[PDB]
Design a protein around this ligand. Sequence first.
Ligand SMILES: Nc1ncnc2c1ncn2[C@H]1C[C@H](O)[C@@H](COP(=O)(O)OP(=O)(O)OP(=O)(O)O)O1
Ligand SMILES: [Mg+2]
Ligand SMILES: [Mn+2]
Ligand SMILES: [Mn+2]
Length: 756
Amino acid sequence: MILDTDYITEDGKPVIRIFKKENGEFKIEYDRTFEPYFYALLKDDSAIEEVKKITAERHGTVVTVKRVEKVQKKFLGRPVEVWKLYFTHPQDVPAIRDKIREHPAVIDIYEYDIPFAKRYLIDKGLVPMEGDEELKMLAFAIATLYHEGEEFAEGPILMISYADEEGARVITWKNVDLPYVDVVSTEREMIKRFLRVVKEKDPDVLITYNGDNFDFAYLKKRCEKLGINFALGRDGSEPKIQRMGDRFAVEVKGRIHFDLYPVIRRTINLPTYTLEAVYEAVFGQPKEKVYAEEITTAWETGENLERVARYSMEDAKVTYELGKEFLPMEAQLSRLIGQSLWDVSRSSTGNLVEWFLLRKAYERNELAPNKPDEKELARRRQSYEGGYVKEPERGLWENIVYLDFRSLYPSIIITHNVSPDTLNREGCKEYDVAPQVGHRFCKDFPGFIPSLLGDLLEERQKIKKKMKATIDPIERKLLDYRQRAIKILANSYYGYYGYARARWYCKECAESVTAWGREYITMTIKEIEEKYGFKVIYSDTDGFFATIPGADAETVKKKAMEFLKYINAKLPGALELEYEGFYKRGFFVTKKKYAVIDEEGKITTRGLEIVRRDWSEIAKETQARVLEALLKDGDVEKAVRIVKEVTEKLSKYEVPPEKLVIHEQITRDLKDYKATGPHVAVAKRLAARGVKIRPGTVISYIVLKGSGRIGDRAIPFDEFDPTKHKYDAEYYIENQVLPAVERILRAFGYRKEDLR
DNA sequence: CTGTGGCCGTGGTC
DNA sequence: GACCACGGCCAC
Ligand SMILES: Nc1ncnc2c1ncn2[C@H]1C[C@H](O)[C@@H](COP(=O)(O)OP(=O)(O)OP(=O)(O)O)O1
Ligand SMILES: [Mg+2]
Ligand SMILES: [Mn+2]
Ligand SMILES: [Mn+2]
């Protein structure tokens, strides 16, 4: 299979490198003939003679048109003949494309900003990660000597651990007597030893957890101190550290550096993303955490270094195990998008969609629309109306069915052929007209995007069917992640229509999808209520919770299935309402905030403080215990004993202050904030103290006893000392616990005074 | 930075 | 005290 592609320049000429594994053998294929190009639409074919002669300059080098080729293509489905302009080197295109566009005989140019190596994969029809090829994988991690107040990587690496199917080992330069620890003389020999292990094992995949932003950068600094050529690349190269957005990403040429952290971070919803939390979440087994402060003391005092080596060995072991489970998912995504696993595992959803569309457009002889310039961008900054959210019938409900449309917006796009190339196109026999917004969409031929979402939805449903029929809970959980990723991807094609930077931007298409969605859900609500006597309790965008008041579970389920058959017979195309769940009880607080319990006893909470990262653990812990007492049982009086059990304690300072930390992210330069909340107030002080605050920084703070603004008496939890500080017990009662649980316990007649 | 809809505490205004 | 914008995170 194809692992990756890039290009190098030899004597001014580009050379594509295709990194392959075939029949167990790694190969580098070199392609010296593939040429960069872009397209030009001319006022008249004869003008190509002048365009051929346009030249530019590129760092002392004259840039010229190598050769030209007239080709027949389509733009948004409409045929048009253009000129394919070839060049010698990819960097020729940015140097000359403006001068060609400015030429009076050139109407417009296209596809002039496509990365050369990805252009190769598309135009050659190559798809990475295709084939029955078994890839050799190796995980690794490092333990370092950390002292606070030091620059990055000022201390040495103490241990390098690695794990594969044959086991896990640890390399260190102190004498630890464990069977899996290899002792060397120096930090230098340790690094050189690890380099040797990788070259000998020759793995196709190097698995890390956050290696993009810690492990490789640490190794780089230490190798620069020690004078080590850290030639992990299969071409003898060192790891290529490059900027990606607001952080970094690391390539190892010829291999796939699979950094699990970006994948895990967007696939699983967790309060924290330590390696320990991720391992237990996936496999349901604990992993002990040894902290940097313990590692340093063990190394300096030589005491209990076995525990550090075990922790390091376990880091590599669980990293390998996690990589085995998540590579297949990312490998499928690589095939769907048609780009390398390295790229798809790290790229934004917009790039995935666009790389996908550029390939499909090439397959269909469709010219890609250009990205917008600054002027067009400013024109695309309007919004549009979205989904319909019903105000809930707040309170406690029983025998509730949840009906929900399958892949609604993608199904709308498929059903009504919602595409920029079908919008208000004249001459067609048939049209679908969007409600409210009135946009018309030709139905005579499949639209570009509509013709592509079908296969994604097909693949997802196949996964979901396999999932539901999977015995192993771990495999099932991974399939759940898999189908959910395609769900989010498919829905991102809708959002792509309203994405200001999109090539195939179409805000009319976007607001037509949402308009149809609002029509379908409100029609379904009216239909289930008027024809089947249901009561709709709450609805959001494309699903609703409903019951028959007074009916038992058997009856509600039966009549729900009857409505589904009826409504699904009326719905066109790919629109289908699904039976998504039955719940014995359910409590709805506001829009987007409710909790339901199924017949097995599993509670599902949405939007409530229990699920929010920016609320105090004691407030979430309390609301959870409250809901459990209400839904799982029926003992409202028990709920009120837990809460008064918590107000008392907080009053007595018997609650661990660790349950009082508030986490809130900094999202911008501190100068750019208009309003200073508690987390910004703390952040501004830390920066004054020299701490360096960047967007993405999380502020973990606690509120101390006082009366002024919250931010005034808020400090980082790193500075909390119970000897000197008494937290604001009345804040965490009146502002964290009570407000969360009161909104629920209202319905049972309780007020805040009866909970304190 | 795929999209819109929404809650709610905070710290301002009057 | 009523009110509002901000800001963060969450449901679709
Ligand atoms: N991340 C998102 N980006 C864009 N639109 C979204 C996103 N999440 C939800 N939506 C929109 C499009 C969805 O069709 C619609 C209803 O959401 P939802 O029911 O969660 O998903 P779905 O209908 O696409 O999948 P499913 O088959 O699981 O119901 O809301
Ligand atoms: Mg839904
Ligand atoms: Mn659904
Ligand atoms: Mn749905």
